[PDB]
Coordinates of C-alpha atoms and ligand atoms in Angstrom, one line a residue:
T1039 CA 21.9 10.2 22.4
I1040 CA 18.6 9.2 20.6
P1041 CA 17.6 12.9 18.2
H1042 CA 15.1 14.3 19.2
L1043 CA 13.0 16.1 16.2
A1044 CA 9.8 18.0 15.4
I1045 CA 8.6 17.2 12.3
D1046 CA 5.4 15.8 11.5
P1047 CA 5.0 13.2 9.5
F1048 CA 1.7 13.2 9.0
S1049 CA 1.4 17.2 8.5
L1050 CA 0.0 18.3 4.8
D1051 CA 3.4 19.9 4.4
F1052 CA 5.4 16.4 5.4
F1053 CA 3.0 15.4 3.1
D1054 CA 3.8 17.5 0.0
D1055 CA 7.3 16.9 -0.2
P1056 CA 8.5 14.2 2.4
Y1057 CA 11.7 13.7 1.0
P1058 CA 14.1 16.6 2.1
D1059 CA 12.4 15.9 6.3
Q1060 CA 13.8 12.2 5.1
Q1061 CA 16.6 12.6 4.3
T1062 CA 16.7 15.2 8.1
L1063 CA 15.7 11.7 9.6
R1064 CA 17.7 9.6 7.9
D1065 CA 21.2 11.5 8.7
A1066 CA 20.0 12.2 12.0
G1067 CA 20.8 8.6 13.0
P1068 CA 19.7 5.4 12.7
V1069 CA 17.2 5.9 15.9
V1070 CA 15.2 8.9 16.2
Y1071 CA 12.7 10.2 18.5
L1072 CA 10.3 12.6 17.5
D1073 CA 8.3 14.8 19.8
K1074 CA 5.4 15.5 18.3
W1075 CA 3.6 12.3 18.6
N1076 CA 5.9 10.5 20.9
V1077 CA 7.4 7.6 19.3
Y1078 CA 10.8 6.8 17.9
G1079 CA 11.6 6.6 14.2
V1080 CA 13.0 4.8 11.9
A1081 CA 14.2 6.1 8.4
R1082 CA 17.9 4.2 6.9
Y1083 CA 17.4 0.7 5.1
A1084 CA 18.9 -0.7 7.2
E1085 CA 17.3 -0.2 9.8
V1086 CA 13.5 -1.1 8.5
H1087 CA 14.4 -4.1 6.8
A1088 CA 15.4 -5.0 10.8
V1089 CA 12.7 -4.4 12.2
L1090 CA 10.3 -5.6 9.8
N1091 CA 12.2 -9.2 10.6
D1092 CA 12.2 -9.4 14.2
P1093 CA 8.1 -9.3 15.1
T1094 CA 8.8 -10.9 18.0
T1095 CA 10.6 -7.6 18.9
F1096 CA 8.4 -5.7 16.7
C1097 CA 5.2 -6.6 17.0
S1098 CA 2.1 -6.0 15.0
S1099 CA -0.5 -7.2 17.5
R1100 CA -1.0 -3.9 19.4
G1101 CA -2.3 -1.8 16.2
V1102 CA 0.3 -0.5 13.5
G1103 CA -0.7 2.7 13.6
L1104 CA -0.2 4.3 16.2
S1105 CA -2.7 3.5 18.4
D1106 CA -2.0 1.0 21.3
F1107 CA -4.9 -1.6 21.3
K1108 CA -3.3 -2.2 24.9
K1109 CA -4.4 1.4 25.1
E1110 CA -7.0 2.2 23.4
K1111 CA -10.3 0.5 21.8
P1112 CA -9.2 -0.3 17.8
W1113 CA -11.8 1.8 15.8
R1114 CA -12.6 -1.5 14.0
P1115 CA -11.8 -5.1 15.2
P1116 CA -8.8 -6.5 14.7
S1117 CA -7.2 -7.5 11.4
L1118 CA -7.1 -11.3 11.9
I1119 CA -4.0 -11.0 10.0
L1120 CA -2.1 -7.6 9.5
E1121 CA -2.9 -6.9 13.6
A1122 CA -2.0 -10.3 14.2
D1123 CA 1.3 -11.7 15.5
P1124 CA 2.7 -15.5 15.5
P1125 CA 1.3 -17.9 15.6
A1126 CA -2.3 -16.9 15.6
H1127 CA -0.8 -15.0 11.9
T1128 CA 0.2 -18.0 10.5
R1129 CA -3.2 -20.3 9.3
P1130 CA -5.0 -17.0 8.1
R1131 CA -1.9 -16.0 6.5
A1132 CA -1.6 -19.9 4.8
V1133 CA -5.5 -19.0 3.6
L1134 CA -4.7 -15.6 1.9
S1135 CA -1.8 -17.0 0.3
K1136 CA -3.9 -20.0 -1.1
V1137 CA -6.5 -17.7 -1.9
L1138 CA -4.5 -15.4 -4.2
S1139 CA -2.2 -17.4 -5.4
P1140 CA -0.2 -18.5 -8.6
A1141 CA -3.0 -21.0 -9.6
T1142 CA -5.5 -18.3 -9.0
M1143 CA -3.5 -15.5 -10.8
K1144 CA -3.1 -18.2 -14.0
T1145 CA -7.0 -18.1 -13.7
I1146 CA -7.4 -14.3 -14.0
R1147 CA -4.7 -13.4 -15.6
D1148 CA -6.1 -12.8 -18.8
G1149 CA -9.2 -11.5 -18.0
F1150 CA -7.0 -8.7 -16.6
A1151 CA -4.6 -7.8 -19.6
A1152 CA -7.9 -7.7 -21.6
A1153 CA -9.0 -5.2 -19.0
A1154 CA -6.2 -3.3 -19.6
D1155 CA -5.6 -3.4 -23.2
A1156 CA -9.7 -2.1 -23.4
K1157 CA -9.1 0.3 -20.9
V1158 CA -6.1 2.4 -22.8
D1159 CA -7.6 1.6 -25.9
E1160 CA -10.7 3.6 -24.9
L1161 CA -8.3 6.3 -22.5
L1162 CA -6.4 6.8 -26.6
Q1163 CA -10.3 7.5 -28.2
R1164 CA -10.6 10.8 -25.6
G1165 CA -6.5 11.5 -25.9
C1166 CA -6.8 13.9 -23.1
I1167 CA -7.9 12.3 -19.3
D1168 CA -7.4 12.1 -15.4
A1169 CA -4.5 9.6 -14.9
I1170 CA -6.5 8.9 -11.7
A1171 CA -10.2 8.4 -12.3
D1172 CA -9.9 7.2 -15.4
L1173 CA -6.9 5.2 -14.8
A1174 CA -5.5 4.1 -12.2
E1175 CA -8.6 4.1 -10.6
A1176 CA -11.0 3.1 -13.1
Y1177 CA -8.9 0.2 -14.1
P1178 CA -8.6 -1.7 -10.8
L1179 CA -12.3 -1.2 -10.2
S1180 CA -13.2 -2.5 -13.8
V1181 CA -11.1 -6.4 -12.9
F1182 CA -10.4 -5.9 -8.9
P1183 CA -14.4 -6.0 -7.1
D1184 CA -15.5 -8.4 -9.8
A1185 CA -12.4 -10.3 -8.7
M1186 CA -14.1 -10.2 -5.3
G1187 CA -17.4 -11.8 -6.2
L1188 CA -18.6 -8.4 -5.5
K1189 CA -22.5 -7.6 -6.2
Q1190 CA -22.6 -3.9 -8.7
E1191 CA -24.1 -1.6 -6.4
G1192 CA -22.5 0.0 -3.3
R1193 CA -18.9 -0.6 -4.8
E1194 CA -18.5 3.6 -4.7
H1195 CA -18.2 2.3 -0.9
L1196 CA -14.7 0.7 -1.6
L1197 CA -12.4 3.6 -1.8
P1198 CA -14.1 5.5 0.7
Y1199 CA -13.9 2.7 2.7
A1200 CA -10.1 2.1 1.6
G1201 CA -9.2 5.8 2.6
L1202 CA -10.7 5.6 6.0
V1203 CA -8.7 2.7 6.7
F1204 CA -5.4 4.1 6.1
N1205 CA -6.1 7.4 7.5
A1206 CA -7.1 5.5 11.5
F1207 CA -3.7 4.2 10.5
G1208 CA -2.2 7.5 11.7
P1209 CA -2.0 9.6 14.6
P1210 CA -5.2 11.8 15.4
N1211 CA -4.8 14.4 13.9
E1212 CA -7.8 16.2 11.4
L1213 CA -7.2 13.7 8.4
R1214 CA -8.4 10.6 11.1
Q1215 CA -11.0 12.6 12.8
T1216 CA -13.1 13.4 9.8
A1217 CA -12.5 9.6 8.5
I1218 CA -13.8 8.0 11.6
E1219 CA -16.8 10.4 12.0
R1220 CA -17.8 9.5 7.9
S1221 CA -17.2 6.3 8.2
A1222 CA -20.8 4.4 9.7
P1223 CA -22.3 3.8 5.7
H1224 CA -18.6 2.5 3.9
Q1225 CA -18.1 0.2 7.5
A1226 CA -22.2 -1.0 6.6
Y1227 CA -21.5 -1.8 3.0
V1228 CA -18.5 -3.7 3.9
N1229 CA -18.9 -5.6 6.7
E1230 CA -22.0 -7.1 4.7
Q1231 CA -20.8 -8.1 1.7
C1232 CA -18.2 -10.3 4.2
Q1233 CA -21.0 -12.8 4.5
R1234 CA -20.4 -15.9 2.3
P1235 CA -24.0 -15.6 0.6
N1236 CA -22.8 -11.9 -1.0
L1237 CA -19.3 -13.8 -2.5
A1238 CA -20.1 -14.4 -5.9
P1239 CA -19.1 -17.8 -6.6
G1240 CA -15.6 -18.7 -7.9
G1241 CA -14.1 -15.6 -6.7
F1242 CA -12.0 -14.5 -3.9
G1243 CA -14.3 -13.9 -1.7
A1244 CA -15.9 -17.6 -2.3
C1245 CA -12.2 -18.9 -1.4
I1246 CA -12.1 -17.5 1.8
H1247 CA -15.2 -19.2 3.0
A1248 CA -14.6 -22.5 1.2
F1249 CA -11.4 -22.3 3.2
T1250 CA -13.2 -22.7 7.1
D1251 CA -13.0 -26.3 7.2
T1252 CA -9.8 -27.1 6.7
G1253 CA -8.8 -26.2 10.1
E1254 CA -6.4 -22.8 9.4
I1255 CA -9.6 -20.6 9.9
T1256 CA -13.2 -21.9 11.1
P1257 CA -16.0 -20.1 9.5
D1258 CA -16.2 -17.2 12.1
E1259 CA -13.1 -15.8 10.9
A1260 CA -13.5 -16.2 7.1
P1261 CA -15.8 -12.7 7.5
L1262 CA -12.3 -10.4 8.3
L1263 CA -10.6 -12.2 5.8
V1264 CA -12.5 -10.7 3.2
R1265 CA -12.3 -7.9 5.0
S1266 CA -8.6 -7.3 4.7
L1267 CA -8.9 -7.5 0.4
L1268 CA -11.9 -5.2 1.0
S1269 CA -9.7 -3.4 2.9
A1270 CA -5.9 -3.7 1.1
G1271 CA -7.0 -4.8 -1.9
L1272 CA -7.9 -1.6 -4.2
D1273 CA -6.7 1.6 -3.3
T1274 CA -2.7 0.3 -2.6
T1275 CA -3.3 -0.8 -6.5
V1276 CA -4.4 2.4 -7.7
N1277 CA -1.9 4.6 -5.8
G1278 CA 0.4 2.0 -7.2
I1279 CA -0.8 2.3 -11.2
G1280 CA -1.2 6.1 -10.7
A1281 CA 2.5 6.2 -9.3
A1282 CA 3.9 4.3 -12.4
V1283 CA 2.0 6.3 -14.8
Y1284 CA 2.9 9.9 -12.8
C1285 CA 6.9 8.1 -13.1
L1286 CA 6.1 7.2 -16.7
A1287 CA 5.2 11.4 -17.5
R1288 CA 7.4 12.2 -15.6
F1289 CA 10.7 10.5 -17.2
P1290 CA 9.9 9.9 -21.1
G1291 CA 13.3 8.4 -21.9
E1292 CA 11.9 5.5 -19.8
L1293 CA 8.6 5.5 -20.8
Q1294 CA 10.4 4.8 -24.5
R1295 CA 13.1 2.4 -22.8
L1296 CA 9.8 0.4 -22.2
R1297 CA 8.0 0.6 -25.3
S1298 CA 11.2 -0.8 -26.9
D1299 CA 10.9 -3.7 -24.5
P1300 CA 7.8 -4.7 -23.4
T1301 CA 8.6 -7.4 -21.2
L1302 CA 10.2 -4.5 -19.1
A1303 CA 6.5 -4.0 -17.7
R1304 CA 6.9 -6.0 -14.6
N1305 CA 10.0 -4.3 -13.5
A1306 CA 8.7 -1.0 -14.3
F1307 CA 6.0 -1.2 -12.2
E1308 CA 8.1 -2.8 -9.2
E1309 CA 10.3 0.6 -9.5
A1310 CA 7.3 2.2 -9.2
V1311 CA 6.2 1.2 -6.3
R1312 CA 9.8 1.3 -5.0
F1313 CA 10.2 4.5 -6.5
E1314 CA 6.6 6.5 -4.8
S1315 CA 5.9 3.5 -1.9
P1316 CA 2.0 4.3 -2.1
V1317 CA 2.4 3.2 1.5
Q1318 CA 4.8 5.7 3.0
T1319 CA 4.7 4.5 6.7
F1320 CA 3.5 1.7 9.6
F1321 CA 3.9 1.2 13.3
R1322 CA 5.6 -1.9 15.1
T1323 CA 5.1 -2.1 19.2
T1324 CA 8.0 -3.0 21.6
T1325 CA 6.9 -6.6 23.2
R1326 CA 10.7 -5.9 25.4
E1327 CA 13.3 -3.6 25.7
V1328 CA 16.1 -3.8 22.7
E1329 CA 19.0 -2.3 21.2
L1330 CA 18.6 -1.2 18.2
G1331 CA 20.9 0.9 16.1
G1332 CA 22.9 1.2 19.1
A1333 CA 20.1 2.8 20.7
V1334 CA 17.5 1.2 23.4
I1335 CA 13.8 1.2 23.3
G1336 CA 11.8 0.1 26.2
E1337 CA 8.7 -2.1 26.1
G1338 CA 5.5 -1.3 25.1
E1339 CA 6.8 1.8 22.6
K1340 CA 5.6 2.3 19.1
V1341 CA 8.7 2.5 16.4
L1342 CA 7.4 4.1 13.1
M1343 CA 8.9 3.1 9.7
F1344 CA 9.5 4.7 6.9
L1345 CA 9.4 2.9 4.4
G1346 CA 9.2 5.2 1.1
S1347 CA 13.0 6.4 2.9
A1348 CA 13.7 3.1 3.3
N1349 CA 13.4 3.1 -0.7
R1350 CA 15.3 5.9 -1.6
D1351 CA 18.1 5.3 1.5
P1352 CA 21.4 6.3 -0.9
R1353 CA 23.1 3.5 1.6
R1354 CA 21.6 0.8 0.0
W1355 CA 20.5 2.6 -3.4
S1356 CA 22.3 3.9 -6.2
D1357 CA 21.0 7.1 -7.1
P1358 CA 17.7 6.9 -5.8
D1359 CA 15.6 9.6 -6.7
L1360 CA 16.1 8.4 -10.1
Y1361 CA 13.7 6.3 -11.8
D1362 CA 15.1 3.2 -13.7
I1363 CA 12.7 0.8 -14.5
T1364 CA 15.8 -1.9 -15.4
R1365 CA 16.7 -1.0 -11.4
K1366 CA 17.5 -3.9 -9.7
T1367 CA 14.5 -3.8 -7.6
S1368 CA 14.8 -7.2 -5.7
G1369 CA 14.5 -5.9 -2.0
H1370 CA 13.1 -2.7 -2.1
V1371 CA 10.5 -2.2 1.1
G1372 CA 7.5 -1.4 -0.6
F1373 CA 5.7 -4.5 0.2
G1374 CA 6.7 -4.3 3.4
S1375 CA 9.3 -7.7 4.6
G1376 CA 9.2 -11.1 6.4
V1377 CA 6.1 -13.0 7.6
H1378 CA 4.0 -9.8 7.4
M1379 CA 5.0 -8.9 3.5
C1380 CA 2.0 -8.5 1.1
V1381 CA 0.3 -11.0 0.9
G1382 CA -2.0 -9.6 -2.0
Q1383 CA 1.4 -8.6 -4.0
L1384 CA 0.8 -11.2 -7.1
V1385 CA -2.1 -9.3 -8.2
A1386 CA -0.5 -5.8 -7.2
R1387 CA 1.8 -6.7 -9.7
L1388 CA -0.3 -8.0 -11.8
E1389 CA -2.3 -5.3 -12.1
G1390 CA 0.2 -3.1 -12.7
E1391 CA 2.0 -5.1 -15.7
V1392 CA -1.0 -5.6 -17.6
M1393 CA -1.6 -2.1 -17.5
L1394 CA 2.2 -1.5 -18.2
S1395 CA 2.3 -3.7 -20.8
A1396 CA -0.9 -1.9 -22.5
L1397 CA 0.6 1.4 -22.5
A1398 CA 4.3 -0.1 -23.8
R1399 CA 2.3 -1.2 -26.4
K1400 CA -0.3 1.0 -27.7
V1401 CA 1.2 4.9 -26.3
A1402 CA 3.4 7.1 -27.9
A1403 CA 4.4 9.9 -25.1
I1404 CA 2.6 10.5 -21.8
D1405 CA 2.2 14.6 -21.4
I1406 CA 1.0 15.9 -18.1
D1407 CA -1.1 18.6 -19.5
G1408 CA -2.9 20.1 -16.5
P1409 CA -2.2 20.6 -12.9
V1410 CA -1.3 18.2 -10.5
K1411 CA -3.4 17.5 -7.1
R1412 CA -1.8 15.3 -4.5
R1413 CA -4.6 13.2 -2.3
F1414 CA -3.9 13.9 0.8
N1415 CA -3.7 10.7 3.7
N1416 CA -2.3 10.0 6.7
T1417 CA -0.6 6.3 5.6
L1418 CA -0.8 6.4 1.3
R1419 CA 1.2 8.8 -1.2
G1420 CA -0.9 9.6 -4.1
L1421 CA -2.7 11.6 -6.3
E1422 CA -6.2 13.4 -6.8
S1423 CA -5.6 14.3 -10.0
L1424 CA -3.2 14.1 -13.1
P1425 CA -4.5 15.0 -16.3
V1426 CA -2.7 14.1 -18.9
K1427 CA -2.5 14.2 -22.8
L1428 CA -2.1 10.3 -23.9
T1429 CA -0.8 9.8 -28.1
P1430 CA -1.6 6.6 -29.7
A1431 CA 1.4 4.7 -31.1
Ligands
LIG1825 C1 0.8 -1.7 -5.2 C2 0.2 -2.3 -4.1 C3 0.5 -2.9 -2.8 C4 1.2 -2.3 -1.8 C5 2.1 -0.8 -1.4 C6 1.4 -3.2 -0.4 C7 2.0 -3.1 0.2 C8 1.7 -4.1 1.2 C9 2.5 -3.5 2.6 C10 3.9 -2.4 2.8 C11 2.7 -4.7 3.3 C12 3.1 -4.9 5.1 C13 2.3 -4.5 6.1 C14 2.7 -4.5 7.2 O1 4.0 -5.3 7.2 O2 2.2 -4.7 8.4 C15 1.0 -5.7 3.3 C16 0.2 -5.8 3.6 C17 -0.7 -6.8 3.5 N1 -1.1 -6.7 1.7 FE1 -0.8 -4.9 0.6 N2 0.3 -3.9 -0.4 C18 -0.8 -4.1 -2.5 C19 -1.6 -4.4 -2.7 C20 -2.3 -5.5 -1.6 C21 -3.5 -5.7 -2.5 C22 -3.5 -6.2 -4.3 C23 -4.3 -7.3 -1.6 C24 -5.1 -8.0 -1.7 C25 -6.0 -8.2 -2.5 C26 -3.3 -7.0 -0.5 C27 -3.1 -7.0 0.8 C28 -2.9 -7.2 1.9 C29 -2.8 -8.1 3.1 C30 -4.2 -8.9 3.6 C31 -1.6 -7.8 4.0 C32 -1.3 -8.1 5.0 C33 -0.1 -9.2 5.2 C34 0.1 -10.2 6.7 O3 -0.2 -9.4 7.3 O4 0.3 -11.0 6.7 N3 -1.7 -6.1 -0.2 N4 0.8 -4.2 1.8
LIG1826 C1 0.2 1.4 7.1 C2 0.2 0.1 8.2 C3 -0.2 -1.1 8.0 C4 -0.1 -1.8 6.2 C5 -1.3 -1.3 5.1 C6 -0.9 -2.6 4.6 C7 -2.3 -2.9 3.6 C8 -3.2 -3.7 4.8 C9 -4.7 -3.0 4.5 C10 -5.5 -3.9 6.0 C11 -5.3 -4.9 6.0 C12 -6.0 -5.7 7.1 O1 -5.7 -6.6 6.6 O2 -6.9 -4.9 6.9 C13 -3.9 -5.7 5.5 C14 -3.3 -4.6 4.9
LIG1827 CL1 -14.6 -1.9 9.1

């Protein structure tokens, strides 16, 4: 009954252009079986949304990558939040939710905004820049490590460690194998910065450690929760901002709308997250036999959810393949959905908004003026290089 497909969603050809294969996956049926990796697949909005919102049946504690922690050893100690289920999930989720709170956003917003204006002003002096290294990477690097309370030395380890994390969710292909074999120095740096003495007062990391006395987490849980922010908190935003700039570069009419109303900045970033879905895919593991989209899935099966595909499903979206900065984006799954829905989304949206605000106010045009290169990663979608000429307003 369930269609079997030979599509490899973790192959370079798929990364290079996923959209036709995603339509093939959607149109084959609500649930598919991927013979390449022996996992179930769901690529339509309805089923992706359903799976995300049933954490009891589709659990995370057996891992959200291909590997089933009940069968294999996780490559690093499990995340206490991403790779945990309720109830163990709940209090660590609460702590990170308060660390990354509206009040915290209120404290850092003006610095985040100044840094974005300054970056755009600096890039306009150069004119011809690489929007990945010089903007999508440089801006988050200029605010997030400091907000974490990290020291200066060793920050070069952060993006490699994140690339490693996101590749390690994937199957054991060459991307994953190579990342792991290169991992040791990046892991060592990150794990050491997670210790209380190494996190500057006032920052996210220190605030996690300060929350170890409330009965929500214990002091021995705080380093791995800092580890979560150092895993998730930089590279995601890099590819998110990268996405938004690429969208503005490819859809000049939308840049023109954004210039005319800079208050559209926050939604213009949200749409870019829908449209490019920086985090493309991840897994759940079934804890029981379950009926999903008319198909029966046994206990202990991995299920692969295509977030980027759900975000382009014409069953849910009008003109999904158009970038529309005034779209009602509410309900997209680029940040997940349900109990694990991105706990860092206020930081993400803050960085995204103030960068696109700076662009809206200072830039007249964004023209690609060189070869675009894609970056391949088992989990993340984004570019290696985006040469653009910026014209000042
Ligand atoms: C555009 C940027 C981002 C995107 C697209 C993104 C995407 C996601 C998605 C899809 C999930 C759900 C994973 C799941 O359900 O298994 C998630 C969870 C999470 N994200 Fe984000 N994220 C972004 C930025 C950030 C930032 C800036 C931080 C930290 C400062 C962060 C930290 C986390 C953490 C700790 C979780 C686990 C939450 C939980 O399991 O309850 N993310 N993210
Ligand atoms: C790729 C499938 C999982 C979704 C990834 C979201 C980003 C993220 C990474 C790592 C951690 C962590 O807790 O370590 C938390 C979130
Ligand atoms: Cl690690």
